[PDB]
Symmetry: C2
Subunit: 165 residues, 2 copies
């Protein structure tokens, strides 16, 4: 399957490529008609990723509640506490996807890193358990190591992540 | 030209791929003999990157002094103040390379992002000028926007970055 991305106002070819961890050239190859530039509201294909819309899992993040809630077909399966971004470095809101992952990243990333479709952002573990449940991050979503391990064992790449205030 | 990487103790195929923002498959293709695994101290090729050793620029970072010093053939050309990592999220030390860049990343990244060859780390600008000169970062090296713009205009991808305490 293919992932379809809805172009947003402000997006540039450069910024979309960075968000999905790909080259503008690869983005252009998968969408030859982009040879004439971008348009807000149009849909385009992101090469190399699975179809998010066949995946029955969905993740909902509440910045205010400091929770990440995993659902399977509208049924809530898990709820985890999280750290979110501080005021000058907030966690971004909107519709995103998990696009890749790295086991054992270590350092502040703890036991697992899951990339989100915003450049430089992800869901990860932590070396500072006291930080969980607080707005103290650079923007990434932090989880207890045991929790990010469990989350990663359940959801595949392509999984939708919706982030709300 | 080709970039040659010196395998370090602790490196895995997964971790090297992540550090250089590539797939293990691509890493394996560029180094067919790795089909038998890794060995600390051996040298391997990282595909798709320029040769760092033809570039006459060299960047030296001092965590203690909070400086980034740019040299051209052993002659110091610029010295900039920087923010570095706090105690639980320190800036890593060792030999790295600038491997790609993104203009206008915005948010905490400010005017420019330059990727370093350690997964998730880079040199970037800032939306918080007061942070420069302090050990308050997640590990990335922060610069004043005007300074990262200037640095990026001078040095090419592949440029060596040596980080010392």
């Amino acid at each position: 399957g293919m992932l379809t991305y809805q172009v947003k106002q402000g997006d540039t070819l450069n910024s979309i490529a960075a968000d999905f961890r790909i080259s503008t050239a690869a983005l252009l190859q998968a969408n030859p008609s982009l040879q004439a530039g971008l348009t807000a509201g149009q849909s385009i294909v992101i090469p190399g990723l699975p179809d998010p819309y066949t995946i029955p899992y969905h993740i909902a993040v509440s910045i205010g509640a400091k929770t990440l809630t995993l659902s399977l077909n509208n049924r809530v399966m898990k709820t985890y506490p999280i750290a979110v971004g501080k005021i000058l470095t907030q966690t971004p809101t909107g519709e995103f996807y998990i696009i890749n992952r790295q086991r054992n990243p270590g350092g502040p990333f703890g036991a697992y890193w899951l990339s989100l479709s915003a450049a430089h952002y992800g869901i990860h573990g932590t070396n500072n358990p006291a930080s969980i449940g607080k707005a103290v991050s650079k923007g990434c979503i932090r989880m207890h190591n045991k929790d990010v391990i469990e989350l990663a064992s359940i959801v595949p790449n392509g999984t939708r992540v919706t982030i709300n205030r």
